[PDB]
């Protein structure tokens, strides 16, 4: 039954990412004055399916072992990185899972650098080196902010987190920390306004958008949600899914609106605006439970 | 070993996706035809802040002990030293463009 | 209560193991039958090979490595 | 040299990382705790060479508690005798799944 | 002697010989030094976890963060070597002859 | 070298308290309350002499006190004790804050009848 | 209007709803209806091993309630 | 798929160390060392291992190989094999197969030691009532006990930062 | 750089060697060695030539592999009898690796290949501080761990260090390589006694440190790196000649002068055992390593080399240098013959 | 002043200064110490009776020893 659990996880990742692409394209269309796409079939579903098919039948051409090894790592992260996400009963009860999130984000940085090395000595690989540098400049911020938002939760176990979110949401004790972390999720997804940047393009594209859905599900679990009532977990599943959907639409909706940074403005902004503010909010979150006598039950 | 089974299934299915991406089209039709310094400062900067993150991050497991004063003292000392390193490169105009 | 159960169970494993060792080494030179290799005759805690020997796979996997990768 | 600001200020800043059998934070033991306690109580006011001469038994006992060497030797010998007598065929073993 | 320790120390020795003999570059030598670092980390970690050596469990994490900043220093030095030349060969280092 | 002392199954046969996890966990406060006055004799035996193969008598004694405890709770109230531990049973790792109504019912049971 | 973007949202939300429902039903379906005993600590694993030992079925969830009192 | 799963992962660990200590091109060496770090993480998590092994995996794989491949890609080229590299791989593979031969076909292997090569479930605890970990309160020291050590550690890292900027053109 | 930054970095070199001195633990000793490395790198490459770049590269590789081999020896020590105390070890193999790691750390003749090459292409302050503190740091550890060492290692490294530090230099004219070969020879003398009475080893360490400070201070009296510059120091000032004369002859080890006192007392507490072949071999090679001293003396102190004008131009200007503490260390390091019973000051 | 120059820096140093100083004013750090000390993990050991103590209550129900009552009273 355990391989059946694995198949019920990683068969809807294909449908999830493909229908995510139609959802984001339709949503951008209605953000503008566009009905795109609706002509190709009933409300545009066979258009992403058959378009994925056409992308698989492109017949491209060509170091070969490196070109093999990069997108296989990207998509095996995209598969193996929905394991401890506690849609009510998670797949593996990891004692620590958030540090596993950080480690596999670093593996995504490996993937980008291997693709840039496989790109065979190009001004594109210099740009991809810069993209590796900007992507690696974010796991400091994400780990430190994640450390502070678990500090009010005691353990790394994330079931304790779903215990903590019953009374009020955790968005209220840490809202600006959450704001900086959500900007870091925009940062880690390598999309707008944080840009730029051959095949197999379907597998690489799949890796990026499964990484997006992972970051949005983890955002939804980390800060808000509903209550885990046993012997009817589907209620929590539905409410969690609705909130994660609204957050992902908001995520693409913020992508729909602003021009993208300058690279040096991005570094300048990152260090000289997030990084002291992270440290200051984090030391305040350290000294907070000793001044409220509320340290969480680290069991 | 359950997670090893998951890793094995995901790795094998992803390799089958890559081989569907490559060795599928049977229609074999027609075969045809300097670096900078400021890139390097960012990596070592990340590296040293990551090391001090590794020093910081076992903080919440430690939160259940008696010596609270020394804990709060050395914790504030660690974040203060990290911010002092940041302010040192900030005031010595290091990471600038 | 669980502690007393554990003590009865480990003494049961040691008794079974020494009886089966007395059988299994019945015609070998040397081999005193009850060798505490430690000179100080005290209670020493066994090392899961003294407990979970001669089992062939199943229960030693569920016992030695059961918690370590359960789920 | 061996300077002793360590003793002149009298601060145990280093005397907790040092051995086993000190005050672990939640008061849990190591694997060979009593062996270290007996070997150190054998070797306290002892001049580091008669420590070799006259704390031999408990030091060997502590070493074979730490590594557990001769016990694994005896275990390997018993398993190889098991292999040769199951090659012989005498008593297809009722150690497993019986008493 | 817990036979995983055998081939861990063997692979340590092979990593050390990789640090010693090298014919073209220096980054590969520093990378084999990092592998030797990993070997020390793994051996100490398996021992402290075996012995229930719960009090001084600082050793593997502190060992790796320190030898990590050692490797960072080595990277800065190799960048300075490669910046005062075009490459980072073992050759073109024979100046200051003896 | 020195021979070992393993007392055989002559003294190593007492009928176990063969109940499961959740019932034993949910019965814990009353188990430590009324009985487990002489098991601290057993624990003091165990910590004053760290050599099990010594404290077998008081291990037998705490086993039979547990058996008598469950007999006493079986003959009297409650049968909804079974309802209480099957209420607390299926809740994963057992949060005691899940099942509260039948905790109150079992409280009134044990206080009135015994 | 955006009445038409709602079927794509609904179908992709069905695709998000399915793995948690399948996982929860498989846990409640292949463990005798009892929830799968989450275990993080060696205490709880020892308790679970003696639980699956005393049941005799070699399944920890059978739970053998209040019968071996005699 | 047997008892010796820790031993097999140790064999693949030695394979990875020989794979980059056979002196390849340094980005292939970084690939092999990523493989080595992953399987060493597997070994330490087999000993459990829950905290520290996957912990420093972030620092080792999550912080070092990225910077090594970064500097390796940007500095020099080796842009498009030799018998010495594959010969070192031959000798490492042969000594590995010789160790497998003498472990599995004999009693013990002694270089200058006494290795009892058998089922390494030994040594292990008899399921005590730990209820946290060893690693939990282990690394949850350094704060109620670690006065001196983390002070000199952070001080050394701050000096490391100022050393790096000086070498790479302080100020 | 900044002077405050140099205050901090030299403070950390002090702190690292003190942590090596002070702890009963092994981890703090390894951290002290590493911090010593990390802080002694930027003292080198104080100028901006690729000479110091390659020197810092060689120093970092040898220094790093020595530290890693030391950590290997400590983890082997805890594979055997397990504690982090700085005392007698419990393995011939771990002590073997530990003495080899400390031999790469300070410099013995199998491992001396990096020392002249790193001491040539560096400024003089960097060379002085690396020689004094990098020979001061491991001798504390050796003093502490001495009762577990097989004598074949220390004896072989000592004999070979004295003879290779003698035989090198006779072709060499660069003064930094001369002084580095002298460092190898005196470290061999400092090593060959440690299994007999270590008080002599730490006394020879004090004497050699004071002599090296006087030597490099009189090489910092003006900017000189070769012998012909020392001939110009002859014709520009007379007192520097006789001071270089007396410090060179005290490095030679002659009885009415202070540098003989570490040699002879070592011979004494050697030969209260039945070691005779070892003192006569060590002392014949101590006769051998005086020849390059003596040809430097013959070059620029007692013969009179022809000089070059613009020394006429240099005659108008005062020696406005700074000396850290020159005359105190000089006359304390030369006239210290009748204070041989200040041996027992070291307990 | 500097409130327009680098305002996030000013807010950072402000919350940092209060995070440093603010533990000097608390009626709650003693509550933190009592909570984090009085949580039992290991086994509460027994001991020999005949020290003749007017303490160490022989019954866990017996409140003769030092205990907690401010817990349930918040």
Short mmCIF file of N, CA and C in Angstrom, two decimals, chain I residues 182-260:
data_model
loop_
_atom_site.label_atom_id
_atom_site.label_comp_id
_atom_site.label_asym_id
_atom_site.label_seq_id
_atom_site.Cartn_x
_atom_site.Cartn_y
_atom_site.Cartn_z
N UNK I 182 68.77 27.37 9.81
CA UNK I 182 69.14 27.43 11.21
C UNK I 182 67.97 27.09 12.11
N UNK I 183 66.76 27.47 11.71
CA UNK I 183 65.56 27.12 12.47
C UNK I 183 65.34 25.63 12.48
N UNK I 184 65.56 24.97 11.34
CA UNK I 184 65.44 23.52 11.26
C UNK I 184 66.45 22.84 12.18
N UNK I 185 67.69 23.35 12.19
CA UNK I 185 68.73 22.76 13.03
C UNK I 185 68.42 22.92 14.52
N UNK I 186 67.99 24.11 14.92
CA UNK I 186 67.69 24.29 16.33
C UNK I 186 66.42 23.57 16.75
N UNK I 187 65.46 23.36 15.84
CA UNK I 187 64.31 22.55 16.21
C UNK I 187 64.68 21.08 16.35
N UNK I 188 65.65 20.60 15.58
CA UNK I 188 66.17 19.26 15.81
C UNK I 188 66.84 19.12 17.16
N UNK I 189 67.63 20.13 17.55
CA UNK I 189 68.21 20.14 18.89
C UNK I 189 67.14 20.22 19.97
N UNK I 190 66.09 20.99 19.74
CA UNK I 190 64.97 21.08 20.67
C UNK I 190 64.16 19.80 20.73
N UNK I 191 64.23 18.97 19.71
CA UNK I 191 63.44 17.76 19.71
C UNK I 191 64.19 16.60 20.34
N UNK I 192 65.50 16.54 20.16
CA UNK I 192 66.26 15.35 20.55
C UNK I 192 66.38 15.14 22.06
N UNK I 193 65.85 16.03 22.89
CA UNK I 193 66.02 15.92 24.34
C UNK I 193 64.72 15.55 25.02
N UNK I 194 63.60 15.65 24.31
CA UNK I 194 62.28 15.74 24.92
C UNK I 194 61.89 14.47 25.65
N UNK I 195 62.42 13.34 25.22
CA UNK I 195 62.16 12.09 25.91
C UNK I 195 63.08 11.86 27.10
N UNK I 196 63.96 12.81 27.40
CA UNK I 196 64.92 12.65 28.49
C UNK I 196 64.67 13.64 29.61
N UNK I 197 64.65 14.93 29.31
CA UNK I 197 64.24 15.96 30.26
C UNK I 197 63.75 17.16 29.47
N UNK I 198 62.44 17.44 29.49
CA UNK I 198 61.89 18.46 28.59
C UNK I 198 62.18 19.89 29.01
N UNK I 199 62.69 20.09 30.23
CA UNK I 199 63.07 21.42 30.70
C UNK I 199 64.13 22.03 29.79
N UNK I 200 65.07 21.20 29.33
CA UNK I 200 66.08 21.65 28.38
C UNK I 200 65.46 22.08 27.06
N UNK I 201 64.41 21.38 26.63
CA UNK I 201 63.78 21.71 25.35
C UNK I 201 63.08 23.06 25.43
N UNK I 202 62.38 23.32 26.53
CA UNK I 202 61.71 24.61 26.62
C UNK I 202 62.71 25.74 26.87
N UNK I 203 63.83 25.45 27.55
CA UNK I 203 64.88 26.44 27.71
C UNK I 203 65.55 26.79 26.38
N UNK I 204 65.83 25.77 25.56
CA UNK I 204 66.37 26.01 24.23
C UNK I 204 65.37 26.75 23.37
N UNK I 205 64.07 26.53 23.61
CA UNK I 205 63.05 27.29 22.90
C UNK I 205 63.10 28.77 23.27
N UNK I 206 63.25 29.07 24.56
CA UNK I 206 63.34 30.47 25.00
C UNK I 206 64.58 31.14 24.41
N UNK I 207 65.72 30.45 24.48
CA UNK I 207 66.98 31.00 23.98
C UNK I 207 66.91 31.22 22.47
N UNK I 208 66.36 30.26 21.74
CA UNK I 208 66.27 30.40 20.30
C UNK I 208 65.29 31.50 19.89
N UNK I 209 64.20 31.68 20.64
CA UNK I 209 63.27 32.76 20.34
C UNK I 209 63.92 34.12 20.55
N UNK I 210 64.67 34.28 21.64
CA UNK I 210 65.31 35.57 21.89
C UNK I 210 66.39 35.84 20.84
N UNK I 211 67.14 34.80 20.46
CA UNK I 211 68.15 34.96 19.42
C UNK I 211 67.54 35.30 18.07
N UNK I 212 66.40 34.70 17.74
CA UNK I 212 65.76 34.96 16.46
C UNK I 212 65.18 36.37 16.41
N UNK I 213 64.65 36.84 17.54
CA UNK I 213 64.17 38.22 17.63
C UNK I 213 65.31 39.21 17.44
N UNK I 214 66.46 38.96 18.07
CA UNK I 214 67.62 39.83 17.87
C UNK I 214 68.12 39.79 16.44
N UNK I 215 68.12 38.60 15.84
CA UNK I 215 68.61 38.43 14.48
C UNK I 215 67.75 39.20 13.49
N UNK I 216 66.44 38.96 13.51
CA UNK I 216 65.59 39.67 12.57
C UNK I 216 65.42 41.14 12.92
N UNK I 217 65.65 41.56 14.17
CA UNK I 217 65.64 42.99 14.43
C UNK I 217 66.86 43.66 13.82
N UNK I 218 68.03 43.02 13.92
CA UNK I 218 69.19 43.58 13.23
C UNK I 218 69.14 43.39 11.72
N UNK I 219 68.27 42.52 11.22
CA UNK I 219 67.98 42.58 9.79
C UNK I 219 66.92 43.61 9.45
N UNK I 220 66.16 44.08 10.43
CA UNK I 220 65.25 45.20 10.22
C UNK I 220 65.87 46.54 10.58
N UNK I 221 67.15 46.55 10.95
CA UNK I 221 67.85 47.82 11.17
C UNK I 221 67.89 48.66 9.91
N UNK I 222 67.93 48.02 8.75
CA UNK I 222 67.63 48.65 7.47
C UNK I 222 67.16 47.56 6.51
N UNK I 223 66.74 47.98 5.33
CA UNK I 223 66.14 47.05 4.37
C UNK I 223 67.25 46.26 3.68
N UNK I 224 67.56 45.08 4.22
CA UNK I 224 68.58 44.20 3.66
C UNK I 224 68.01 42.80 3.52
N UNK I 225 68.32 42.15 2.40
CA UNK I 225 67.95 40.75 2.19
C UNK I 225 69.08 39.88 1.68
N UNK I 226 70.16 40.45 1.15
CA UNK I 226 71.30 39.68 0.68
C UNK I 226 72.56 40.10 1.44
N UNK I 227 73.67 39.45 1.09
CA UNK I 227 74.92 39.70 1.79
C UNK I 227 75.54 41.02 1.36
N UNK I 228 75.38 41.40 0.10
CA UNK I 228 76.02 42.61 -0.39
C UNK I 228 75.39 43.85 0.23
N UNK I 229 74.09 43.75 0.53
CA UNK I 229 73.45 44.74 1.38
C UNK I 229 74.08 44.78 2.76
N UNK I 230 74.53 43.64 3.28
CA UNK I 230 75.20 43.66 4.58
C UNK I 230 76.58 44.29 4.49
N UNK I 231 77.22 44.22 3.32
CA UNK I 231 78.47 44.96 3.14
C UNK I 231 78.21 46.47 3.12
N UNK I 232 77.07 46.86 2.55
CA UNK I 232 76.70 48.27 2.64
C UNK I 232 76.34 48.68 4.07
N UNK I 233 75.78 47.76 4.87
CA UNK I 233 75.58 48.06 6.28
C UNK I 233 76.89 48.18 7.02
N UNK I 234 77.92 47.46 6.57
CA UNK I 234 79.25 47.71 7.10
C UNK I 234 79.67 49.14 6.84
N UNK I 235 79.62 49.56 5.58
CA UNK I 235 80.20 50.87 5.33
C UNK I 235 79.29 52.03 5.73
N UNK I 236 78.04 51.78 6.13
CA UNK I 236 77.22 52.89 6.59
C UNK I 236 77.17 53.06 8.10
N UNK I 237 77.47 52.01 8.88
CA UNK I 237 77.41 52.09 10.33
C UNK I 237 78.31 51.04 10.96
N UNK I 238 79.10 51.39 11.97
CA UNK I 238 80.05 50.42 12.53
C UNK I 238 79.47 49.53 13.62
N UNK I 239 78.42 49.99 14.30
CA UNK I 239 77.93 49.24 15.45
C UNK I 239 77.10 48.05 15.00
N UNK I 240 76.41 48.18 13.87
CA UNK I 240 75.64 47.07 13.31
C UNK I 240 76.53 45.91 12.93
N UNK I 241 77.77 46.20 12.51
CA UNK I 241 78.73 45.15 12.17
C UNK I 241 79.04 44.29 13.38
N UNK I 242 79.42 44.91 14.50
CA UNK I 242 79.83 44.14 15.67
C UNK I 242 78.62 43.48 16.33
N UNK I 243 77.43 44.06 16.19
CA UNK I 243 76.27 43.40 16.76
C UNK I 243 75.84 42.19 15.95
N UNK I 244 75.87 42.30 14.61
CA UNK I 244 75.64 41.14 13.76
C UNK I 244 76.71 40.08 13.99
N UNK I 245 77.95 40.53 14.22
CA UNK I 245 79.05 39.64 14.56
C UNK I 245 78.75 38.81 15.81
N UNK I 246 78.33 39.47 16.89
CA UNK I 246 78.17 38.76 18.15
C UNK I 246 76.91 37.89 18.12
N UNK I 247 75.85 38.34 17.45
CA UNK I 247 74.65 37.50 17.37
C UNK I 247 74.86 36.29 16.48
N UNK I 248 75.60 36.45 15.38
CA UNK I 248 75.97 35.31 14.54
C UNK I 248 76.84 34.32 15.31
N UNK I 249 77.80 34.83 16.08
CA UNK I 249 78.65 33.92 16.83
C UNK I 249 77.92 33.29 18.02
N UNK I 250 76.83 33.89 18.49
CA UNK I 250 76.03 33.21 19.50
C UNK I 250 75.11 32.18 18.89
N UNK I 251 74.69 32.40 17.65
CA UNK I 251 74.03 31.33 16.92
C UNK I 251 74.99 30.19 16.63
N UNK I 252 76.28 30.48 16.53
CA UNK I 252 77.27 29.44 16.32
C UNK I 252 77.45 28.53 17.52
N UNK I 253 77.27 29.05 18.73
CA UNK I 253 77.42 28.20 19.89
C UNK I 253 78.84 28.10 20.42
N UNK I 254 79.40 29.22 20.84
CA UNK I 254 80.76 29.24 21.37
C UNK I 254 80.74 29.55 22.86
N UNK I 255 81.60 28.90 23.65
CA UNK I 255 81.43 28.85 25.14
C UNK I 255 81.40 30.18 25.88
N UNK I 256 82.18 31.24 25.51
CA UNK I 256 82.04 32.47 26.32
C UNK I 256 80.83 33.31 25.94
N UNK I 257 79.88 32.71 25.24
CA UNK I 257 78.76 33.42 24.67
C UNK I 257 77.51 32.59 24.95
N UNK I 258 76.34 33.23 24.86
CA UNK I 258 75.14 32.65 25.47
C UNK I 258 74.58 31.48 24.68
N UNK I 259 74.83 31.41 23.37
CA UNK I 259 74.24 30.34 22.59
C UNK I 259 74.88 28.98 22.78
N UNK I 260 75.97 28.91 23.53
CA UNK I 260 76.56 27.63 23.89
C UNK I 260 75.80 26.95 25.00
#
